[PDB]
Amino acid sequence: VVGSHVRHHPSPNTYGVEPLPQEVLKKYIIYAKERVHPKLNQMDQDKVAKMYSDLRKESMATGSIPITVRHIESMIRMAEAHARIHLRDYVIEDDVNMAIRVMLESFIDTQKFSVMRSMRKTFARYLSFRRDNNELLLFILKQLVAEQVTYQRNRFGAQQDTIEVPEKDLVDKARQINIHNLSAFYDSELFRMNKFSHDLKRKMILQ
Amino acid sequence: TVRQLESMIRLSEAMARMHCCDEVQPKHVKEAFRLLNKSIIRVETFSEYCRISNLIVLHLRKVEEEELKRSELVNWYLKEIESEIDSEEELINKKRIIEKVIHRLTHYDHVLI
Amino acid sequence: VFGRWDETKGEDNIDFMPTILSRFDMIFIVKDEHNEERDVMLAKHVITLHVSALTQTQAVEGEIDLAKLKKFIAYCRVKCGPRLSAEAAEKLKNRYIIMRSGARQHERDSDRRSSIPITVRQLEAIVRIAEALSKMKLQPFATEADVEEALRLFQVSTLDAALSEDQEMLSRIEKQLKRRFAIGSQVSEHSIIKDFTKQKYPEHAIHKVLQLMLRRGEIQHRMQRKVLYRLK
């Protein structure tokens, strides 16, 4: 915000390589709308049916806001949208998986705390399509840091100058998510972006 | 919110205009920050009860998620406080206070079952 | 009223007064019958429809075109209108008397005013449905088969809506569970299942009651999904 204010006086942060210019984006949108019509001749009905049945069963097991047919249709629409992005005349498994992930995220985000947590724990398989393990580890580390900061603020009455967390808890949670290596996460750019440091002398993570 | 940040920038610019300086220096920012802090007024109703309740909730939720009874909770809290209480009178007073607070939380506030 | 139907509550799920409900000839109730095998059929049917919408638009088995059906309906409505016969009238009289007596007996036994009453308007509705069925065949007089079909439809819709043994048995299970449970006590699901199977009640009813209680929020899970505890 301050940079934007300073730049506009009267007198590259994302992982993407290069954003497209606005005119090229407009031309791409026009061309995709005009000349792309994806077809669903290669859909896999069995997987969708099994996923819908499992979703309905577990939603009723939780007992709040069951899923319906409508979402599936929306999923199909999203799939076609993805097929329009790549100019594919036929929809493939990648678009279907992306639409499934988006629909499941949207459905889960609307539930209350306990139900949302249970659904997120249960459906980790579908929500992890084309995701980054570094992002998940960062989320775990953020949760641990937030818990530690909350405890410190509640007990001491004020924040401390440094935040530390043992590596063993993160390793155990990664094992729970079936991750056994964290060297790449330490060497990842996300680790440095959030100003985290790893100390092997004490086997700790400091922020 | 960020609107407060924009207001701080505007107040710094206003102070710079008032002092006729051609650039914004940290004095103006400090003055704007002080004025914005003095604008905000805290609500008067109690903090100790909230802190104790938050600590109890955090401990119970951590226990539930990682893998006790009321007596176990009280014993754990006293064990954690051990380094903070020097006399038996203060210890028993705090024990009675936490017992009453736990009873209120379980029965009155319905926070704990 | 609550957003989703509650089978055990029976009545009070309809906010409309009985006066406006008496005007309607038939009332249908649809519920989300959750079957594992049924959902796969629906999903496959939807996907097949979406796929085949692009290529072919043809009648499945002798289905009439929309324009042809419209013109045929208009022609039938304009052309002729039938009326009832004596034997069908006597049969409908007997059936209506029996239905009204049964409804009165049910209201007296249940000790609660039914939100869907039965009156002369229902008899006129049955007459009208029989007349429509006769009109569908352009016959000048209705037959007993049309009256039987109209009575079957009126039963399946209205009597099912109003009388809404399965539900009474579910209510019995609900009352028994409420009496057995206590506030703050924990119960294992296996114990409930064993206790109600020793009473020879179906397991599906118990599971449905448990799901409804979970929806209401009375029952919560303490340790994974094995042991439940009662809340309010």
Distance of CA A197 to the CA centre of its chain: 23
Q: Which residue has the tokens 């049916």?
A: A49
Of C126, C118, C146, the C-alpha closest to C134 is: C146
Q: How was this structure determined?
A: cryo-EM
B6 annotated as ligand-binding = yes
Tokens standing for residue C124: 């006129």
**Residue A21, phi then psi, degrees to nearest 5:** -70, 160
Q: Which residues in chain B touch residue C229, judged by CB atoms under 8 angstroms apart?
A: 113
Give yes or no for a contact between C122 and C158, defined as CB atoms under 8 angstroms apart.
yes
CB atoms B51 and A155 under 8 Å: yes
CB contacts < 8 A, A to B, total: 18
Query: Going by DSSP bridges, is the β-strand pair C219-223/A204-206 parallel, antiparallel, or unpaired?
Result: unpaired
Residues 6+ apart with CB under 8 A from B8: B29, B32, B33, B36
Query: How many angstroms is the resolution?
Result: 3.2
CA angle, residues B84, B85, B86, in degrees to nearest 5? 120
The half-sphere exposure of B60 on its side-chain side, counting CA atoms within 13 A, is: 18
Q: Which residues in chain C touch residue A60, judged by CB atoms under 8 angstroms apart?
A: 34, 211
Chains with at least 3 CB pairs less than 8 angstroms from chain C? A, B
| CB nearest to A63's CB, from C42, C50, C215 | C215
The A164-166 sheet, strands edge to edge = A164-166, A204-206, A197-199
Q: Which residues in chain A touch residue C226, judged by CB atoms under 8 angstroms apart?
A: none
Residue A124, SS3 per DSSP: helix
- C interface mutation test: which of A51, A60, A71, A75 has the most C CBs within 10 A? A60
> What is the DSSP-derived secondary structure letter of residue C141?
B
The C227-230 sheet, strands edge to edge = C186-188, C227-230, C219-223
| CB nearest to A154's CB, from B5, B6, B58 | B58
Give the whole-angstrom CA distance, residue C1 versus residue C19: 18
Please name the residue ranges forming H helices in chain A.
2-7, 22-35, 45-62, 69-85, 93-109, 113-122, 124-127, 133-156, 167-176, 183-187, 189-193
Q: Which residue has the tokens 């692009």?
A: C54
Please name the residue ranges forming H helices in chain C.
18-23, 36-52, 66-79, 86-110, 120-136, 144-154, 160-163, 166-180, 189-198, 203-216
Helix (H) or strand (E) holding B31: helix B26-39
Give yes or no for a contact between B46 and B74, defined as CB atoms under 8 angstroms apart.
no
Tokens standing for residue B55: 């600590």
Of A61, A76, A119, A48, the C-alpha closest to C34 is: A61
| CB nearest to A60's CB, from C44, C54, C211 | C211
CA distance to partner chain C, nearest, from residue A91 (Å) = 11
Q: Which residues in chain C touch residue B113, judged by CB atoms under 8 angstroms apart?
A: 184, 229, 231
